[PDB]
Amino acid sequence: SDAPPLTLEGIKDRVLYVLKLYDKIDPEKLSVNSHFMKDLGLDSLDQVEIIMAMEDEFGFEIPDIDAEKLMCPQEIVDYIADKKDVYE
Amino acid sequence: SWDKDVYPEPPRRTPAPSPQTSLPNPITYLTKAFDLLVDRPVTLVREFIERQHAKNKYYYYHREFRRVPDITECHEKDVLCMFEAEMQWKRDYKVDQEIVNIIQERLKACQQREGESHRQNCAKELQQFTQVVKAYQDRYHDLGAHYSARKCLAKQKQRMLAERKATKEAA
Amino acid sequence: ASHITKDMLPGPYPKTPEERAAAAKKYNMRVEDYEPYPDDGMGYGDYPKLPDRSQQERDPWYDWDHPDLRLNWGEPMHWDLDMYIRNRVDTSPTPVNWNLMCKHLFGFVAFMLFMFWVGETYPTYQPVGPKQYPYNNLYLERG
Amino acid sequence: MNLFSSLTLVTLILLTMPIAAINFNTHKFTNYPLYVKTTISCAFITSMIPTMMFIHTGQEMIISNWHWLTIQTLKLSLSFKMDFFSMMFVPVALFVTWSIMEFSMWYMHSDPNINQFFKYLLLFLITMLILVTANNLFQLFIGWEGVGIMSFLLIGWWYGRTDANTAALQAILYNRIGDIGFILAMAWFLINLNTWDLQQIFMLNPNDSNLPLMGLILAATGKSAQFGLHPWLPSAMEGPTPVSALLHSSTMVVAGIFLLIRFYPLTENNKFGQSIMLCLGAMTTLFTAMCALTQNDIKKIIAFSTSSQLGLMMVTIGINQPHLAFLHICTHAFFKAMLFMCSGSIIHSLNDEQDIRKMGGLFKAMPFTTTALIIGSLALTGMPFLTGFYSKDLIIESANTSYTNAWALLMTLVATSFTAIYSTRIIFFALLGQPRFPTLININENNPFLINSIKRLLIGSLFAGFIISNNIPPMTIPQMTMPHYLKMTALTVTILGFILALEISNTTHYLKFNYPSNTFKFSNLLGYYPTIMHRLTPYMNLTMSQKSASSLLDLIWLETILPKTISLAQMKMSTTITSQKGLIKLYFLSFLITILIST
Amino acid sequence: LTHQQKVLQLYKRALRHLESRCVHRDKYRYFACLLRARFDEHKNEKDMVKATQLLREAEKEFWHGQHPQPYIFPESPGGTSYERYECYKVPEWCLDDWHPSEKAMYPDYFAKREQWKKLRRESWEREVKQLQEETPVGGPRTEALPPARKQGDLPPLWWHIVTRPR
Amino acid sequence: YEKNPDSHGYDKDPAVDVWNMRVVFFFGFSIVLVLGSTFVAYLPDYRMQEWARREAERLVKYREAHGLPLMESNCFDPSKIQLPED
Amino acid sequence: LDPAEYDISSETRKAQAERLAIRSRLKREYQLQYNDPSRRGVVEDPALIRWTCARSANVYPNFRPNTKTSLLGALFGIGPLIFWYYVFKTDRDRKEKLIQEGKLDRTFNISY
Amino acid sequence: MLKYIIPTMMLMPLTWLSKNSMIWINTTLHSLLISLTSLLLLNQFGDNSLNFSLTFFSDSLSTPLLILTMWLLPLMLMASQHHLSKENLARKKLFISMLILLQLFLIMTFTATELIFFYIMFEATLVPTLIIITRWGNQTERLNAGLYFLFYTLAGSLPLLVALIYIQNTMGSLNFLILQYWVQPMPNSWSNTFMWLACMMAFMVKMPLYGLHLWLPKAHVEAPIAGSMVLAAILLKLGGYGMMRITLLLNPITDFMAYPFIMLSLWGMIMTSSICLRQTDLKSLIAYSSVSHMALVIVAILIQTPWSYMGATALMIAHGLTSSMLFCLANSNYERVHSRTMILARGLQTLLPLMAAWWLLASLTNLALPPSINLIGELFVVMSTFSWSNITIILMGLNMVITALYSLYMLITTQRGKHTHHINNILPSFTRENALMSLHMLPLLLLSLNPKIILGPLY
Helix, strand or coil: CCCCCCCHHHHHHHHHHHHHHCCCCCCCCCCCCCCCCCCCCCCHHHHHHHHHHHHHHHCCCCCHHHHHCCCCHHHHHHHHHHHCCCCC | CCCHHHCCCCCCCCCCCCCCCCCCCCCHHHHHHHHHHHHHHHHHHHHHHHHHHHCCCCCCCCCCCCCCCCCCCCCCCCHHHHHHHHHHHHHHHHHHHHHHHHHHHHHHHHHHHHCCCCCCCCHHHHHHHHHHHHHHHHHCCCCCCCCCCHHHHHHHHHHHHHHHHHHHCCC | CCCCCCCCCCCCCCCHHHHHHCCCCCCHHHHHHHCHHHHHHCCCCCCCCCCCCCCCCCCCCCCCCCCCCCCCCCCCCCCCCCCCCCCCCCCCCCCCCCHHHHCCHHHHHHHHHHHHCCCCCCCCCCCCCCCCCCCCCCCCCCC | CCHHHHHHHHHHHHHHHHHHHHHCCCHHHHCHHHHHHHHHHHHHHHCHHHHHHHHHHCCCCCECCCCCCCCCCCCCCCCECCCCHHHHHHHHHHHHHHHHHHHHHHHCCCCCCHHHHHHHHHHHHHHHHHHHCCCCHHHHHHHHHHHHHHHHHHHCCCCCCHHHHHHHHHHHHHHHHHHHHHHHHHHHHHHHHCCCCCCHHHHCCCCCCHHHHHHHHHHHHHHCCCCCCCCHHHHHCCCCHHHHHHHHCCCCHHHHHHHHHHCHHHHCCCHHHHHHHHHHHHHHHHHHHHHHCCCCCHHHHHHHHHHHHHHHHHHHHCCCCHHHHHHHHHHHHHHHHHHHHHHHHHHHHCCCCCCCCCCCCCCCCCHHHHHHHHHHHHHHCCCCCCCCHHHHHHHHHHHCCCCCCCHHHHHHHHHHHHHHHHHHHHHHHHCCCCCCCCCCCCCCCCCHHHHHHHHHHHHHHHHHHHHHHHCCCCCCCCCCCCCCCCCCCCHHHHHHHHHHHHHHHCCCCCCCCCCCHHHHHHHHCCCCHHHHHHCHHHHHHHHHHHHHHHHHHHHHHHHHHHHHHCCHHHHHCCCCCCCCHHHHHHHHHHCHHHHCCCC | CCHHHHHHHHHHHHHHHHHHHCCCCHHHHHHHHHHHHHHHCCCCCCCCHHHHHHHHHHHHHHHCCCCCCCCCCCCCCCCCCCCCCHHHCCCCCCCCCCCHHHHCCCCCCHHHHHHHHHHHHCCCHHHHHHHHHHCCCCCCCCCCCCCCCCCCCCCCCCCCCCCCCC | CCCCCCCCCCCCCCCCHHHHHHHHHHHHHHHHHHHHHHHCCCCCCCCCHHHHHHHHHHHHHHHHHCCCCCCCCCCCCCCCCCCCCC | CCCCCCCCCCCHHHHHHHHHHHHHHHHHHHHHCCCCCCCCCCCCCCCCHHHHHHHCCCCCCCCCCCCCHHHHHHHHCCHHHHHHHHHHHHHHHHHHHHHHCCCCCCCCCCCC | CHHHHHHHHHHHHHHHCCCCCCHHHHHHHHHHHHHHHHHHCCCCCCCCCCCCCCCECCCCCHHHHHHHHHHHHHHHHHHHCCCCCCCCHHHHHHHHHHHHHHHHHHHHHHHECCHHHHHHHHHHHHHHHHHHHHHCCCCCCCCCCCHHHHHHHHHHHCHHHHHHHHHHHHHCCCCHHHHCCCCCCCCCCHHHHHHHHHHHHHHHCCCCCCCCCCHHHHHHHCCCHHHHHHHHHHHHHHHHHHHHHHCCCCCCHHHHCHHHHHHHHHHHHHHHHHHHHHCCCCHHHHHHHHHHHHHHHHHHHHCCCHHHHHHHHHHHHHHHHHHHHHHHHHHHHHCCCCCCCCCCCCCCCCCCHHHHHHHHHHHHHHCCCCCCHHHHHHHHHHHHHHHHCCCCHHHHHHHHHHHHHHHHHHCCCCCCCCCCCCCCCCCCCCHHHHHHHHHHHHHHHHCCCCHHHCCCCCC
């Protein structure tokens, strides 16, 4: 079975959750629209880290070429959304 | 009901059961029960089929083949005699084949019967085995695909001559 | 349709290299590729003018849908695809070690040196002068 | 006595299912997999009766049924050979497959192909049963290539994933080399003994058994995983877990040596034979000890462990102790079948990573599976006093003594030790540290299928080896007088490697940057890639030589058409000139009256 | 190919092999932190050749840090999955013909599916026009597929609506 | 590329197909496979080998009961034969 | 095999190799990429037909000029083959000898 | 036998005069009705080969091969349709007529007593096949591979007539019965050299030995499926058959003369078995397979042990059904996507989930699976050849491993690993395909119960 799917609410809560666990920036501004770099100015090497440990959160895929350009959180949710099987 | 002395069944020599200790009866419940469940319910049927067969009998005969002059009295050619000779040669041949089968099976059943005794009580039957299979080995063994009589008679010529020189060197 | 030129015979000098660039990969080093077909050909070894390539690994990496393993692309097939895909090795850095295995066979030949020599039964071994070994040897007497 | 005719019932009790799997084509939709399972148990009890009958009175009766053709001097029929090898084995096979089939009802519930799957796996079982019950060597051969191709299909269960079916093909390849050995043995038995009948070959003992029995060594080495041909197992992991379980326990890789055991009276002699035995099974023990460590796929660890075991059993056919081996096959079946059928609980429970990295600690809502892992681990360690001890410890006691070439004693020691250190690996990783792995725990132990499966297999295991213990009608003189330092080393080595590996991976300091050269030779300096890739190219080279004979054949025929090209010149030798053929035919015609003048 | 993905790739798979190295994840942490500094001192210099040089030095020094069985998450090519289920993927062009009986076995699916057949049968002219318009001569430069401006479908859609993984 | 609309479907163009599968499945599967398979299943004893078994049994029994060694080799009695000479 | 030297790509090789390479590629990607409705049969791509025709050995029937070719082929079917001729004839004749003299110890051989 | 000669000759006008659309029905029907009596043909017993009439008779071997032929027509013809299923009626009746006439000359050939009647009917068998594959073969450039193919035959295939007529006037009768009993030893010398070599190589051109094997592949890729099942299920077994009989004489000669050919077949078995591994274009794989098994047959013929024949003939029949069927699989795959190239499409475990079972089953029957007749024959042959040379098993069993590898490689990459998804044509199965497959395997699996029918004259 391996029953539970990842739904939109769930994945949202997850990317959102772990990005709130990232310490060096505050939960202050975190939103699917809230810009993943320009807002927080985080290192691009550090977004490589974000996609690293987030992949280790969901455990799959994420090729380097597509991982490069990801950015905003809603977008990450989208990539995981079409790659996994998500929508109703 | 096969012919007995062709296929020996030695004495059955069944041992006498001794309980020797007082316990349950693990198989014997089911050997009796089996002999209740699977013995009679089949036996009735086989017996009924028996009487059904027996109400109308048949008779079928084992064929015979008479003898002929075989290879000797045939002239070098003029097949009309030869055909009989060499084909019945082929019959007697297959007969010898099945003899070899019989002995070869006696040996197998012998070891299976003896048990761990493998070299005890098969010596006689293995002995006559080496006798027969050395005979077949000597006679029919190496000829080839195309063989009739001419080639068996041939090989026998070969041995008779080789042993005639062997018996002049016997001096 | 199968065009008048679907493949093969090389050897016309000047414009055949570019002609083979057409119908195949065409570029500087690709003109040198169709050309590398006629260079690898040299004197005829039964290989026609089909283009050339290397044995390096173009393999599954998740994008671009590479050659004939799973084919979304229409470029040249080289000579390989009857080798690679299903059962093959093709390219890697590789350990390239012929010692370690043959030095387990060192363990074997070491054994066969142990083959004529032996361990014995009881209790212990190699005080040896001309001592007994199993065959039970000399005399017999007690009294 | 005819209750052994019920023994030849049980085989048809197995035969029953596929007939249902074909003819009706509907009620199978009613969950027959349950039905298959029930047929297996029926075969287990109906197969259990004859064992009891034997172990009181013996009485092994071979039946030929109706004979297979005739041909010339040898009429080969077919048989079911009750050797106490069959009598004792078949309840084990049916029992372990009972487990693996119920577990499979838990494992495959999502897969839409489940029914077909049981058709295969069951059929695989039929090929096994017909192999281990047969005497007449042709029927051996039948079960042989049967279980072989079944290994191909089952390891190849997943269409696609080139890796999978590729592994399958390598497997069947090795089986087929084992086959070349086998049919060598067959042929020799014909020409020299004028039969292959497993009774008759026993009766007349060939003075020279060298060559054929060597062939038997080869055939054993093909399936049994033995040395010089490894890659079978580690890529054989690619099949679905239950198939892998059934593959390394009761079937196949044990059926390799099961043949050598079958011929044991013929291998009593030709100490050349036992020599090769302990020259080789040794090499698999310590080899797979050297190449087994550090590879991090749990299932694969389990594999290399079974390879090392099989080495130890080959060594048990060394000297003369075939029965001790046989017992160790049965016990091994229980223990490692347990180990896989739990490892699946780990894997599928985890989602599926099946890498020993990540994993986690022992008890996290996983009480019963981990219990199975220290019953099975602690079991396969060589046992302290537990069941399999009745195999392995006796084995190293007798092998520890007498005429062994003595390169095999140290082999036994460090072999079993590194088995214990496998166990220490899987505990120090899978069962030890606090959980580290992809989050969102999905784990579930709650389902009657698993708990009942592992349940029955462990309840049996600890009590099964004890029945097999002292019901083994004595076949030889046990050592039983065992000297100091040749006695006290059985358990003691398992503790020296136990402690040694314990302190190896315990209290580990900073681990970063470089690792050893041995760890790069622990994966391997290729015995997998060198032989597979290298041996893969050579047939293509022979295709180049084939282009030599083909290009030379159509180059010679092109020398005939070149002789037709320049034979047209023998036609083109005509100059088409009326002053040529007319006056030359007149001059050379007067040369027909010149040649006819003297001719 | 640019310095960006070059450096960033070496960093990423360096973290990967480092993951595979250690255990209990904390030692992995502060080691990965020492590495974080090892690239953290970097990047503050826009000198051109010095950089690629030192990178290559990290290419050898990295190549030392590869043990032969780096951890591979299941779904990519690797010893766990990479389409375990691949025999289960049946393309939607199959079932275009089943028997009309079984086509009646599930009466309402092919309704909406027929709305798709008409969706993309009505289409592809809008598609071919938009594409034949946009493409520069030969369409050499672009592997991409730019959207549609008018209200409607994105033109090369058909295969990109896929049989899903299991 | 002609394919079929697959109105039902079979071998050939419509309305004769049913008859086609009827004749080929019947005469092909029914009569020859089952019927013939019963024919050659048990036909009269082939190559005579059953007779060979019976005759072998009788003859061997005679050979022991009268004490002659069975299977004398020499396919033809040297009592009647002649040999070339050097 | 073993990516190494981390080529600096220069300038031409950058411009030429990039632009021309991915030029032709994307040309052909988009080419077979059409994937419209209304095609019932295969996509037929002219690729791999060249593979098949060439691998049908187009230069096989013509000729084989000498060079090293007759040496590679002749020596390719020479050494092992004719030596196997010699070994099967050898062991043949030996077998015949030990049959005709001494003993091969066949004893019971029979079916052969 | 004449009772089998009339009904097909009557089966000709059945074709010619008929209503359109019923030709397949009438031909198939009455042809199977022939197959029944073909199964009647087995009286064979005891020792003397039955003799129907003084012109032509049957021993064992002729009977299995004949049964296979008369069985094979209805399945063949049954298979050939939908290759066309559009044409003028004259094409259809011409084609079925040609298959008929071909069968007639085959029956003539197998039954023929006297070797000249055998030879006349021999080339008279070759012509109809040629007309079949050349007149429409799908003709890739046509290769002209029917015609100079007939030259590959006749080139060295004519002089065997010379040698025959020599045997005629020297000994009188060429009746096979009386050629037996009158056969007299022929010493080793240069005249008997050219003779033995004449007859031998004359038949050895048909079952290709590795030297001549270039014969098959082109001729068999250009053949329409009917002509293929004709060709490789039968027309090789003619060469091997006549070989079986004419080896009656040549008694000592075949030793010193045999040895080089034996060598060439033992090596070429491995070579051919190799080259068939790496090729594309599936239709060739089964061809070179046929070359391999036939090489094994020749090996079996020259060494004269009876075991060698039993395994031999068993291999003739088993390889006939197996190779034939497997061809028909290649075709049933070819109508789906027009390729002939193996690697092009893939999958078909997903799609056509039943057609799997026939791929698998047939490939296994060519994998030498133990109960399968193919392994009976191959097994006895390996026994014979090991008796001849203790050493040769390296080569034999090496053929076991390779034949395993390609025989099981064909089972994959056509049938497994992915669907290429740019196809979207293949229409699921047919009832006819299942009928053809079934009619192949089901008897090949049943024969694996009572094989003593198909084992050779010596048994």
